[PDB]
Amino acid sequence: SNMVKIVTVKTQAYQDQKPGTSGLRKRVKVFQSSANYAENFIQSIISTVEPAQRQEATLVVGGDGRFYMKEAIQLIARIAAANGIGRLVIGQNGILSTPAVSCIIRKIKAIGGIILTASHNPGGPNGDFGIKFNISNGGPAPEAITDKIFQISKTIEEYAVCPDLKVDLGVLGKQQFDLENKFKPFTVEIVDSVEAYATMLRSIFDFSALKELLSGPNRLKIRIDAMHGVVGPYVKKILCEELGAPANSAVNCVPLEDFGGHHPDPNLTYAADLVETMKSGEHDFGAAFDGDGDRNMILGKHGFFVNPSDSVAVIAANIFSIPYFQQTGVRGFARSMPTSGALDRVASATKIALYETPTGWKFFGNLMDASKLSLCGEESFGTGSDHIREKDGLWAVLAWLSILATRKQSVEDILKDHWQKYGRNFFTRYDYEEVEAEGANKMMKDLEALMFDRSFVGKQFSANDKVYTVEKADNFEYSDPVDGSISRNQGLRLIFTDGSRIVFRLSGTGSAGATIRLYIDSYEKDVAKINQDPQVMLAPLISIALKVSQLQERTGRTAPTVIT
Ligand SMILES: O=P(O)(O)OC[C@H]1O[C@H](O)[C@H](O)[C@@H](O)[C@@H]1O
Ligand SMILES: [Mg+2]
Numbered sequence: 001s002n003m004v005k006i007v008t009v010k011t012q013a014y015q016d017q018k019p020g021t022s023g024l025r026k027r028v029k030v031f032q033s034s035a036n037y038a039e040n041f042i043q044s045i046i047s048t049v050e051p052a053q054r055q056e057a058t059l060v061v062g063g064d065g066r067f068y069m070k071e072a073i074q075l076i077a078r079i080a081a082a083n084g085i086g087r088l089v090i091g092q093n094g095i096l097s098t099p100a101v102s103c104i105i106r107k108i109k110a111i112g113g114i115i116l117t118a119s120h121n122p123g124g125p126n127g128d129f130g131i132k133f134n135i136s137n138g139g140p141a142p143e144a145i146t147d148k149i150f151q152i153s154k155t156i157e158e159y160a161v162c163p164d165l166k167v168d169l170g171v172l173g174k175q176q177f178d179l180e181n182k183f184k185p186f187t188v189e190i191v192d193s194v195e196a197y198a199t200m201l202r203s204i205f206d207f208s209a210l211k212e213l214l215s216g217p218n219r220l221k222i223r224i225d226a227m228h229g230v231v232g233p234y235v236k237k238i239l240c241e242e243l244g245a246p247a248n249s250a251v252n253c254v255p256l257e258d259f260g261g262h263h264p265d266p267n268l269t270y271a272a273d274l275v276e277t278m279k280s281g282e283h284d285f286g287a288a289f290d291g292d293g294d295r296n297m298i299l300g301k302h303g304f305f306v307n308p309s310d311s312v313a314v315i316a317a318n319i320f321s322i323p324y325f326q327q328t329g330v331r332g333f334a335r336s337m338p339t340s341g342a343l344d345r346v347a348s349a350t351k352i353a354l355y356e357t358p359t360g361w362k363f364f365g366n367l368m369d370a371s372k373l374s375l376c377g378e379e380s381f382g383t384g385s386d387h388i389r390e391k392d393g394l395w396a397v398l399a400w401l402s403i404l405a406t407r408k409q410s411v412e413d414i415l416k417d418h419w420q421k422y423g424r425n426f427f428t429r430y431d432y433e434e435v436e437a438e439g440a441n442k443m444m445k446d447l448e449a450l451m452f453d454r455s456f457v458g459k460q461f462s463a464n465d466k467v468y469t470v471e472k473a474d475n476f477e478y479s480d481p482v483d484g485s486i487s488r489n490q491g492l493r494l495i496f497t498d499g500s501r502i503v504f505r506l507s508g509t510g511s512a513g514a515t516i517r518l519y520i521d522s523y524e525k526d527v528a529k530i531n532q533d534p535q536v537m538l539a540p541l542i543s544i545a546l547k548v549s550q551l552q553e554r555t556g557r558t559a560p561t562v563i564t
Contacts, residue, residue: 001164001166002175002176002177002178003177003178003179003180004081004162004163004164004165004177004178004179004180005162005163005164005179005180006081006082006160006161006162006179006180006181006182007082007160007161007162007163008158008159008160009036009039009158009159009160009161010157010158011035011036011039011040011156011157011158011159012035012036013040013153013154013155013156013157014034014037014040014153014154015154017037017040017041017044017149017150017153017154018146018150019131019132019133019141019146019149019150020146020509021140021360021361021362022119022130022132022140023115023117023118023130023131023132023133023140024041024130024131024132025118025121025128025129025130026128026129027127027128027129028067028068028123028124028125028126028127028128028129029125029126031068031072031129032068036159038072038075038131039075039079039159039161040153040156040159041131041149041153042072042075042076042079042080042114042131042159043079043083043156043159043160044149044150044152044153044156045114045133045149046079046080046083046085047083047152047156048145048148048149048152049085049111051084053111054083054084054085054086055084055085055086055184056086057085057086057087057110057111058086058087058088058089058108058109058110058111059076059080059085059087059088059089059110059111059112059113059114060088060089060090060096060101060104060105060108060110060112060113060114060134061073061076061077061088061089061090061091061094061096061113061114061115061116062090062091062094062095062096062097062100062101062113062115062116062193063094063095063096063115063116063117063230063292064095064097064098064116064117064118064119064123064229064230064255064264064291064292064293065093065094065095065229065230065255065256065257066116066117066118066123066124066127066128066129066257066258066259066291067123067124067125067127067129067257067258068123068129069094069116069129069257070093070094070169072116072129072131073090073094073116073167073169074166074167075161076088076114077090077165077167077188078161078162078163078165079159079160079161079162080186081162081165081177081179081186082160082161082162082179083160084182085186086184086186086187087186087187087188087189088167088187088188088189089104089108089110089188089189089191090167090169090188090189090190090191091190091191091192091193092169092170092172092190092191092192092193093169093170093193094116094169095193095230095233095255096115096193096230097193097197097230097231097234097292097293097294097394098115098117098119098132098230098292098293098294098390099197099293099294099388099390099391099392099393099394099395100193100194100196100197100234100293101113101115101134101138101390102134102138102139102388102389102390103138103196103197103200103387103388104191104196104197105134105136105137105138106137106138106388106389107196107200109136110136111135111136112133112134112135112136112141113133113134113138114131114132114133114134115130115131115132115133115134115292116129116130116131116132117130117132117230117291117292118130118291119290119291119292119294119295120263120264120265120266120290120291120292120295121263121291122258122259122262122263122264123257123258123259123264123291124257124258124259124261125258127258133145133146133149134389134390137365137369137389138388138389138390139361139362139365139389139390140361140362140365140389140390142362143362162177162179162186165177165186167188167190168190169190170190171190172190172191172192173189173190174187174188174189175187175188175189175190176188193233193234194233194234194237194238197234198234198237198238198242200387200388201238201394201395201398203324204322204323204324204387204395204398205322205323205324205398205399205401205402206323206402206405207242207243209402209405209406210243210398210401210402210405211242211243211244212405213401213404213405214239214243214244214245214249214401215243215244215245216244219245219246220284220285220401220404220405221249221282221283221284221285222239222245222249222283222284222285222286222287222401223249223251223274223277223278223283223285223286223287224239224245224249224250224251224253224286224287224288224289224397225251225252225266225271225273225274225286225287225288225289226250226251226252226253226255226288226289226293227252227259227260227262227264227265227266227270227271227288227289227290227291228252228254228255228256228258228259228260228262228264229252229255229259229264229289229290229291229292229293230255230291230292230293231253231289231293231393231394232250232252232253232254232255233253233255234293234394235249235250235253235394236250236253238394251273251274251277252273259291264289264290264291265290265291265295266287266288266289266290266295266296266297266381266393267288267297267381267564268297268305268564271288271297274286274287274288274297274299275299275303276303278299278300278301278302278303278304279302279303281301281302283301284300284301284404284410284411285298285299285300285301285400285401285404285411286298286299286300286303287299287393287396287397287400289393289394290381290393293392293393293394294382294384294390294391294392294393295380295381295382295391295393296308296381296382296383296393296394296396296397297381298311298396298397298400298411299411300410300411300412300415301410301411301412302412304411304412304415306411306415307340307379307427307534308339308377308378308379308380308381308382308383309335309339309340309342309343309377309379309425309427309521310340310342310415310418310425310427311377311383311396311400312335312339312342312343312375312376312377312383313340313342313343313345313346313377313418313422313425314400314403314414314415314418315375315383315396315399315400315403316333316343316346316347316350316375317346317350317418317421317422318403318406318407318414319374319375321402321403321405321406321407322399322402322403324385324387325374325375328374329374330350330352330374330375331371331372331373331374331386332352332353332354332355332367332372332373332374333346333347333352333353333354333355333373333374333375333376334354334355334356334357334363334364334367334373334375334376334377335354335355335356335357335376335377335378336356336357336358336359336360336363336377336378336379337356337357337358337359337476337478337490337491337493337503338359338379338429338491338503338505338517338519339377339378339379340379340425340427340519340521341425341499341501341521341523342422342424342425342427343377344356345422345423345425346422349422353372355367355372355373357478358476358478358487358490358491359378359490359491359505359508361389361390361391363478363480363487364376364384365389366480366481366482366483367481367482368386368389369389369482370481370482372481373386374386376391378391379427379429379519379564380429381393383395383396383399384396416530416531419530419531420527420530423499423523423524423525423530424523424524424530425499425521425522425523425524426520426521426522426523426524426534426537426538427519427520427521427522427534427538428519428520428534428535428538428542428563428564429517429518429519429520429562429563429564430516430517430518430519430520430542430560430562430563431515431516431517431560431561431562431563431564432515432516432517432518432551432555432557432560432561433511433515433561433562434511434512434513434514434515434561435513435514435515435516435555435556435557436513436514436555437513437514439554439555439556440506440513440514440516440554440555441506441514442554443516443549443550443551443554443555444492444504444506446550446554447492447504447548447549447550448475448492450548451473451474451475451492451494452473456470456473457470457471457472457473458470461544461547461548462540463539463540463541463543463544464539464540466540466541468496468497468498468500468540468541468544469496469497469498470494470495470496470497471495471496471497472493472495473492473493473494473495474492474493475488475489475490475491475492475493476490476491476492476493477490478490490505491503491504491505492504492505494545494548498523499523500521500522500523500541501519501521502518502519502520502521502541502544502545502548503518503519503521504516504517504518504519504545504549505517505519515561516551516555518545518549518551518560520538520541520542520545522537522538522540522541524537535563
């Protein structure tokens with residue numbers, strides 16, 4: 001069973017195996033009931049590697065532990081072997097967080113990786129399955145490569161497979177497979193899921209300082225919720241075993257194939273258990289990760305909610321508490337365009353460049369690969385640095401713990417100090433889910449044409465005490481300074497003279513009919529206004545956003561589906 005035949009299987013192409021920014025995501029039942037669905041796609045990824053480059057190539061493979069992952073990893077090995085891929089590096093039990101895969105690709109100079117995750121979407125027999133492809137910089141495959149995969153998948157007629165090859169995913173070490181009529185062996189390395197990632201973090205952060213923060217009498221009390229997803233064993237081996245947090249600090253830290261039956265998505269309703277725990281007042285700091293570990297929600301004593309746009313501003317303002325940045329320097333800051341302007345206040349005060357990018361990783365990774373980006377953030381619970389080429393939720397928690405250790409203040413007092421220094425960007429996102437496309441597209445086309453008229457800049461909108469004056473209004477465009485690409489129609493912005501913004505986007509992650517995302521960013525300098533309820537302070541700007549867009553009239557919605 002270490003010697004196996006290579007066979008050619010005739011297959012039929014599917015027409016919809018189109019990777020997006022985040023991979024190919026289908027319902028598990030589709031993968032199961034569509035013959036050769038996964039095989040076709042895996043073969044299609046590998047066909048993008050020139051045969052002459054396969055023998056010396058390594059692919060990193062792992063996923064978030066959801067149902068169907070181990071069957072898929074076996075299939076990757078069976079096809080990789082038969083196609084002449086020299087070596088796979090696989091996390092034990094198939095487990096690798098998305099940041100760990102990025103770490104390992106870059107550490108061992110793999111040609112890329114295949115991540116078995118649908119991120120924050122549910123899993124289990126009735127949920128979703130995802131297949132991501134990352135390339136040699138450890139980041140997501142860019143669109144030129146995912147298009148080739150899609151093209152290959154639509155006309156594929158056969159794949160090569162080693163049907164008798166079986167990998168033991170549970171034991172560490174090197175497994176070799178001799179292939180019938182092939183001279184060199186196929187090699188699988190099962191590595192510890194956490195080791196390489198933990199070794200990386202060990203050089204970024206001061207584990208001594210953190211261990212002192214988290215251990216003993218006056219320890220910072222923390223509660224970390226992996227939501228039954230991939231970050232679980234990372235929490236246990238790093239925060240508990242190595243840094244000395246008591247074991248009760250790690251909740252939902254055993255990966256479950258169905259993520260305990262819930263969405264592994266960190267926000268106030270999907271992580272309501274963590275929130276309710278934090279309300280008790282016993283713990284100083286709480287955090288939640290998504291299913292594959294690149295997203296994070298940060299909570300403080302009493303359930304104080306650090307909104308992600310503030311979180312990256314705070315890290316930016318205390319960035320040299322982290323030894324990595326002490327030693328590399330700060331090459332730049334970035335946030336997606338819809339993210340709040342809190343980061344800009346910090347970057348302006350410290351004379352560091354601020355990149356405002358369209359939604360999507362590739363803009364961040366481009367700037368990182370150019371040595372221009374050290375810290376980036378997304379209002380959708382994303383924080384990252386150039387230590388890898390994916391966002392990193394556990395990294396962001398360690399960043400926070402490092403800042404708490406040097407600041408010696410509560411999470412809430414750090415935010416109050418921040419807002420007093422930079423002013424506060426009150427922020428919320430309204431999601432209108434599954435609105436009819438005709439209404440939503442009409443709402444956007446009409447609003448854009450309203451904004452383009454000569455009189456729109458300088459117009460004044462008032463609601464209560466607030467007056468907002470239009471400084472600029474446009475449909476966001478981005479000329480990418482690395483790859484030359486021009487990204488257009490990236491979101492309608494109403495930029496007011498006072499620092500506030502309204503942003504409208506249509507979601508590019510198509511559900512079934514459009515979803516509208518309305519971002520409200522209201523800047524406030526007054527000290528008697530910075531400690532107010534955000535929804536109260538955002539109401540004037542929300543009123544204006546609905547009035548000028550005519551959203552209720554276009555869509556029939558009187559209320560968002562989700563407020564964040
Ligand atoms: O285009 P949208 O629907 O607004 O989604 C954009 C989002 O897609 C994924 O969920 C990524 O994890 C996020 O980085 C990104 O913000
Ligand atoms: Mg994710």
